[PDB]
């Protein structure tokens, strides 16, 4: 169906450790493909997926140059925000930025994004129209007015509807074997007696891609999400994801309960019985 390319950036000031930590990660859908970590030895943008290693060396030189420029912008920004908020040079502070683009099933532009946060709160973000800004407070209002003068939105919109979507399409073709593949969950169910009148049913979904999924327990075809423990979808570490959902039920009523699994890779949702 639809697809996305996303970059995530974190910068954390360290008056104690000198220069701020800076981490950047790039994702197409739920697959990481690049990283830069200022605390790592390489000081380069690094591949994290095999299909991006098809990129020539001008790619890696050029992304390394621009990610180091991103870092310097964020470093200057932490100092600007310290002033805007009248804070002292003592404490550690954090800036977080996310940007990227979505395309539809036709791979045509669908939406663009560019959001910025200071110390874990919304600071400023670009609206859906890619031409105006939502400033979260009075300090961000100054950034909005500055960026309006300099056509910062029109600079970002050119990238988000053009460069961003064309590189996503390129990556989706170059990595067609893995990025365009869906991996349906491997499923099984476990049963544990918690007392001789109650028992835990656990429904498992393993090795699936992308991360989006719905696991639901039903009794007699009626919802039990309220009664269900659902763990957060977690990475397996190999590019796939895991999740489980469990209900505690009366012993001898296990047969009323069904587990339902919906996922992109499943042409029809499946039902698990004990």
């Amino acid at each position: 169906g639809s697809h996305s390319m996303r970059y995530f950036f974190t910068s954390v000031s360290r008056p104690g450790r000198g220069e701020p930590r800076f981490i950047a990660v790039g994702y197409v859908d739920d697959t990481q493909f690049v990283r830069f970590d200022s605390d790592a030895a390489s000081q380069r943008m690094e591949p994290r997926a095999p299909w991006i290693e098809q990129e020539g060396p001008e790619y890696w030189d050029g992304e390394t140059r621009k990610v180091k420029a991103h870092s310097q912008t964020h470093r200057v920004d932490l100092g600007t925000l310290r002033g805007y908020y009248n804070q002292s040079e003592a404490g550690s502070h954090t800036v977080q930025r996310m940007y990227g683009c979505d395309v539809g099933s036709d791979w045509r532009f669908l939406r663009g994004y560019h959001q910025y946060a200071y110390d874990g709160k919304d600071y400023i973000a670009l609206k859906e129209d890619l031409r105006s800004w939502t400033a979260a407070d009075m300090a961000a209002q100054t950034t909005k007015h500055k960026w309006e003068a300099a056509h910062v939105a029109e600079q970002l919109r050119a990238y988000l509807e053009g460069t961003c979507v064309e590189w996503l399409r390129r990556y989706l073709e170059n990595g067609k074997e893995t990025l365009q593949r869906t991996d349906a969950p491997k499923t099984h169910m476990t049963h544990h007696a918690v007392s001789d009148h109650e028992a835990t049913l656990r429904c498992w979904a393993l090795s699936f891609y992308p991360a989006e999924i719905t696991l639901t327990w039903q009794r007699d075809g009626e919802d039990q999400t309220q009664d269900t423990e659902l763990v957060e979808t977690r990475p397996a570490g190999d590019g796939t994801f895991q999740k489980w959902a469990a209900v505690v039920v009366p012993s001898g009523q296990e047969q009323r309960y069904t587990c339902h699994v919906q996922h992109e890779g499943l042409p029809k949702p499946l039902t698990l019985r004990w």
Binding site: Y7, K66, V67, V76, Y99, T163, C164, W167
Partner: peptide
Amino acid sequence: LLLDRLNKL
């Protein structure tokens, strides 16, 4: 691919 120039706050 990254944005080519990130503008300062």
